[PDB]
Design a protein around this nucleic acid. Structure first.
Ligand SMILES: Nc1nc2c(ncn2[C@@H]2O[C@H](COP(=O)(O)OP(=O)(O)OP(=O)(O)O)[C@@H](O)[C@H]2O)c(=O)[nH]1
Ligand SMILES: [Mg+2]
Ligand SMILES: [Mg+2]
Ligand SMILES: [Zn+2]
Lengths: 337, 102, 112, 71, 135, 136, 55
RNA sequence: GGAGGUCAACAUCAAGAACUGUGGGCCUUUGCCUAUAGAACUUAUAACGAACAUGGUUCUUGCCUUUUACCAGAAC
RNA sequence: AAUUUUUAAGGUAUGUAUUUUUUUU
């Protein structure tokens, strides 16, 4: 078996370029909880906030377009539809509100969560919504009639995150009981349970192509192949915890933001960490306020947007020089257990 | 619409209580503080290790040192006595008086 | 009967979400074995620290793990920002003459 | 001590019905039924003659506030 | 691999068909002739001996429909399927103090820096300038 | 400033650009509607069919003595536009802009008053003609 | 603006008394109720707000 | 077979001034061009109704101890 | 050159027991 681990030095994974800080956008009165980008045109992005607003930022120039009020408590998660001109926002005030983009007003409230709802996922093909929160369940809403059609009972604790996939398991959910469940919605029961995490799973991201899912915990970032549900890879991590956010670029780049401010880029295929950064917090902030609460890659995949606990948005750009002049990353040491 | 004010009352009985009643309450708590919460037992109760072990309460309410046979008006007085030079001696005398026999 | 968040029961909900949000982080930092009494105790440090923020008292503590202190300071800066921003918003609302009710005035002037 | 809030499933397993008891709320009445798809003596005489900080309270906008409304 | 086009067009259809069954049934349940505008022998008895035809009689529109329906609580037993494997100094560092508040004691459980040269220099000038003026 | 300092643009954003009414996702409309400015027929299949056979009219265009250009003038509400409205309906076999009401009698059809202002203003603003053949 | 604010103020206090009982009916509250001096048992409030305001 | 029914079901009724069907031509049937057949009901001081109510959400207001009940304008 | 009318609720608690024909040794 280790004869293979002798050959496991033959891969030498996939060089990638280093990431650097292009621009910093202030302008939010609270923390920036969540970020979503225009799925079609990469023209602008939306930003949840502690201060209850949402602001639409112009992506090219970083200027501000319009602000969207309408929640009385923080806005935890945000989704913008590929197929619709709709913005779905969700808050800690137990409410899930649609936003018709053409007129920029509220359209449809979705009612019937018990307590705060921290996540929204739009099903790709079905005109459904998936939301979940401290209530420990997922509700699948008919987007047109605002009916909580299907309620997926499951995790024994608050659900942190929710994803949607077109084929089987259509709903991936990750709660604080350290279980990532893969749901069968038509039968309303769990297809497969992934227990390998030690503690609460605070972030999950879907790969734009490969059809797999990444999960995160304190020290551990795993991956999982959907369908079967098998473990695929692991990601090498020294104690980086807490992992708040994962995002996957088209290029097999995997970003993991921390609560220590340390940004950690990986290589999705290998599980190698090819860089680490630390944000420079802000002028008058505290060392406690240096962290990363969200993230995304735009559709091109060359620019990363992460809102941070210092009330700032930072757009992280990939270096054009790069290659192997001096890129070389943390340089591939496969330590053993 | 007198709800504008913001005061109110519960519907039970007749509130304030009588100045004499406050003193009884206040002189129990003061003797709880200075006593550091210990229950000093009555003299007749047939002995919860005591903090010390000599102080008691007679059939009346007064406090007494059973070594020194002194009578005390309050806890404050007792702490004067326990920190006194007479209550020092009677411990030494009982010290010797025990060290001469078993 | 899931009851919506309204004007009267707003800041109670703000409390509840804050307390949960702090237990999440601090429990995800610590190594493993024992939480619940420890879970209860950590929150008392939080509220105490907020009281200290309102009174401008610094809130140092004897031996406390630094990361926990980082967490508590972070959330208290969030809560302080929201508290101040509402203090200003209600104040301009009162100035221009719009109806601010009653105890929002009496509450405001304490904040200011 | 809120501790463990309330799980949905116990409220989702109740035998009322799929819907609630059948109470008809005022906000569940059908609305936006259709979706939308995307595609010089005087001068002389005198004696004295001739950055954004991150915080709410120490900021520049704040001092202006207490410079006015606290008078 | 990616799910593929022919498979995603399948589960899209079979789910979309299923959901409509839930939406239709749910709209037509509650009290609205208004909202319900959006909407088999079935039995071979036992050994099949008799056969069966089932027909649901029309209820009187005044009387409560679902006469047996009444809102009641139910505690649910646990699901059949079982046993999913879990497959997973500092105690003195992470030992928390005990919280003691100055502002509450419920139930039981009983500056450095010096001045500036600014002040030093200013008072001399006022002390000197005064002595000069008092002379 | 310097904490990033060199290659980085730190920009503080208050107020707004893009006034709040703008769609932020613009309504996508393929068809080009002229119905606000004028009431017009933009599709060839819908042009009213002419009994008199247009291509025979195009033959008359060559002979200079054959055609005469005649404008109609007069004071207010003398019937000029409603006069023209006689010649056209007699010329064309079916017109899509005829309601059963204007066909019957009650409301005059006004073919020449195409503009929406002229319809509302109850008046003729800009001159509009037609080219049609008619026998003496 | 001072005159406008007078007209608002005086009506707001009279409304204070009216809402104090339970009516906005004009018929119940003829101006003698607000304007008779306290020596005859009214409020004796002193009205500067009737006027006519130059527009 | 006709005249009817305070009978029923089903289909349809706010859109490039705005409908369908057909034959041919380019594309290789969507779509474009061309010839042709048939277009009931509703529309230009714009509409199934020569009539006219209520509710919901979000804004701006008015009464102002708070919710219901409310003031009166807008958008959807 | 013209306003506009009123009903509920936040105040007098709340809780427990009480009219019963003698279940076979
Ligand atoms: N009683 C009567 N009224 C008519 C007759 N002919 C036209 N009218 C009315 O008089 C008005 C004149 O119709 P138009 O053709 O629009 O008037 P016009 O000649 O176009 O006036 P312009 O604005 O100058 O173009 C219309 O409102 C008609 O309803 C008529 O013979 N008898
Ligand atoms: Mg009370
Ligand atoms: Mg109340
Ligand atoms: Zn003694």
């Amino acid at each position: 078996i280790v004869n293979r681990y002798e050959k496991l030095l033959s891969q030498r994974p996939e060089w990638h370029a280093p990431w650097k800080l292009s621009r910093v956008i202030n302008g939010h009165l609270g923390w920036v909880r969540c970020v979503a980008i225009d799925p079609v045109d990469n023209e602008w992005f939306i930003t949840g906030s502690n201060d209850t607003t949402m602001k639409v930022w112009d992506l090219a120039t970083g200027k501000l377009k319009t602000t969207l009020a309408g929640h009385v408590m923080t806005v935890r998660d945000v989704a913008v539809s590929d197929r619709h001109p709709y913005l779905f926002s969700v808050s800690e005030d137990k409410t899930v509100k649609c936003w018709d983009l053409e007129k920029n007003q509220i359209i449809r409230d979705y009612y019937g969560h018990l307590s705060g709802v921290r996540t929204v996922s739009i099903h790709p093909t079905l005109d459904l919504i998936a939301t979940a929160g401290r209530d420990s369940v997922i509700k699948l809403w008919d987007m047109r009639t605002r009916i909580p059609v299907i309620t997926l009972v499951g995790h024994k604790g608050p659900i942190n995150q929710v994803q949607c996939t077109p084929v089987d398991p259509q709903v991936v959910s990750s709660s604080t009981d350290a279980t990532v469940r893969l749901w069968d919605v038509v039968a309303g029961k769990t297809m497969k349970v992934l227990t390998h995490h030690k503690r609460s799973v605070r972030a999950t991201a879907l790969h734009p192509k490969e059809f797999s899912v990444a999960s995160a915990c304190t020290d551990d970032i795993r991956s999982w192949g959907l369908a079967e549900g098998s473990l695929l890879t692991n990601f090498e991590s020294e104690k980086t915890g807490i992992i708040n956010t994962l995002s996957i670029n088209q290029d097999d780049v995997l970003f993991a933001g921390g609560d220590n401010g340390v940004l950690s880029f990986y290589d999705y295929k290998s599980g190698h960490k090819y860089q680490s950064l630390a944000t420079r917090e802000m002028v008058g902030s505290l060392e406690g306020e240096r962290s990363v609460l969200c993230s995304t890659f735009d559709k091109t995949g060359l620019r990363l947007i992460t809102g941070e606990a210092d009330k700032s948005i930072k757009i992280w750009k990939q270096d054009e020089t790069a290659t192997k002049e001096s890129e070389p990353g943390l340089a591939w040491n496969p330590n053993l257990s | 619409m007198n709800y504008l004010e913001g005061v109110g009352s519960k519907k039970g009985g007749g509130g304030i209580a009588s100045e004499s009643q406050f003193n009884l309450q206040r002189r129990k708590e003061v003797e709880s503080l200075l006593s550091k919460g210990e229950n000093v037992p009555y003299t007749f109760q047939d002995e919860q290790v005591r903090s010390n072990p000599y102080i008691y309460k007679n059939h009346s309410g007064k406090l007494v040192c059973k070594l020194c046979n002194t009578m005390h008006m309050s806890w404050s007085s007792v702490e004067r006595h326990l920190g006194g030079k007479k209550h020092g001696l009677n411990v030494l005398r009982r010290g010797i008086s025990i060290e001469k026999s078993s | 009967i899931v009851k919506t968040t309204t004007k009267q029961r707003l800041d109670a909900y703000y409390d509840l979400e804050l307390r949960n949000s702090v237990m999440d982080d601090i429990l995800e930092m610590m190594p493993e074995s024992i939480r619940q009494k420890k879970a209860r105790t950590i929150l008392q440090h939080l509220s105490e620290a907020w009281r200290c923020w309102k009174a401008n008292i610094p809130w140092d503590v004897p031996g406390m793990p630094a990361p926990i202190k980082k967490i508590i300071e972070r959330y208290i800066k969030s809560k302080a920002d929201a508290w101040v921003s509402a203090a200003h918003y209600n104040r301009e609302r009162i100035k221009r003459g719009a109806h601010v009710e009653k105890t929002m005035v009496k509450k405001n002037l304490g904040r200011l | 001590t809120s501790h463990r809030p309330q799980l949905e499933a116990r409220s989702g397993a109740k035998a009322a019905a799929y819907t609630p008891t059948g109470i008809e709320h005022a906000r569940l009445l059908p609305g936006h039924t259709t979706l939308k798809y995307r595609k010089r003596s005087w001068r002389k005489g005198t004696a004295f003659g001739r950055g954004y900080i991150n915080d709410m309270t120490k900021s520049e906008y704040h001092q202006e506030f207490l410079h006015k409304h606290v008078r | 691999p990616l799910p593929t086009k022919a498979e995603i067009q399948e589960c899209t259809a079979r789910t979309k068909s299923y959901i409509q069954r839930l939406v239709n049934a749910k709209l037509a349940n509650s009290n609205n002739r208004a909202s319900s505008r959006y909407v088999a022998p079935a039995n071979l008895l036992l050994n099949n001996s008799h056969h069966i035809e089932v027909v649901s009689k029309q209820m009187d529109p005044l009387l409560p429909r679902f006469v047996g329906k009444k809102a009641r609580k139910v505690v649910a037993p646990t699901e059949n399927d079982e046993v999913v494997p879990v497959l997973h100094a500092d105690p003195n560092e992470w030992k928390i103090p005990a919280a003691v508040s100055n502002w509450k004691n419920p139930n039981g459980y009983t500056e450095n820096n010096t001045i500036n040269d600014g002040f030093m220099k200013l008072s001399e000038a006022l002390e000197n300038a005064d002595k000069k003026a008092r002379q | 400033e310097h904490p990033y300092g060199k290659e980085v643009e730190v920009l503080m954003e208050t107020k707004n650009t893009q006034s709040p009414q703008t769609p932020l996702v613009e309504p996508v409309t393929e068809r080009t509607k002229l119905q606000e400015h004028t009431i017009f027929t933009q599709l060839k299949k819908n042009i009213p069919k002419t009994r008199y056979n247009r291509d025979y009219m195009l033959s008359m265009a060559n002979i200079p003595e054959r055609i005469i250009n005649v404008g109609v003038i007069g004071p207010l509400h003398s019937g000029k536009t409603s006069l023209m409205d006689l010649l056209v309906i007699d010329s064309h076999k079916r017109i899509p802009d005829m309601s059963k009401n204007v066909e019957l009698g009650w409301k005059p059809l006004r073919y020449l008053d195409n503009l929406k202002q002229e319809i509302d203003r109850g008046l003729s603003i800009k001159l509009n003609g037609s080219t049609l053949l008619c026998t003496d | 603006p001072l005159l406008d604010i007078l007209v608002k103020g005086e009506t707001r206090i009279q409304n204070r008394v009216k809402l104090g009982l339970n009516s906005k009916m004009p018929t119940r509250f003829p101006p003698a109720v607000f304007y008779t001096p306290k020596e005859l048992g009214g409020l004796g409030m002193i009205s500067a707000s009737h006027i006519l305001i130059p527009a």
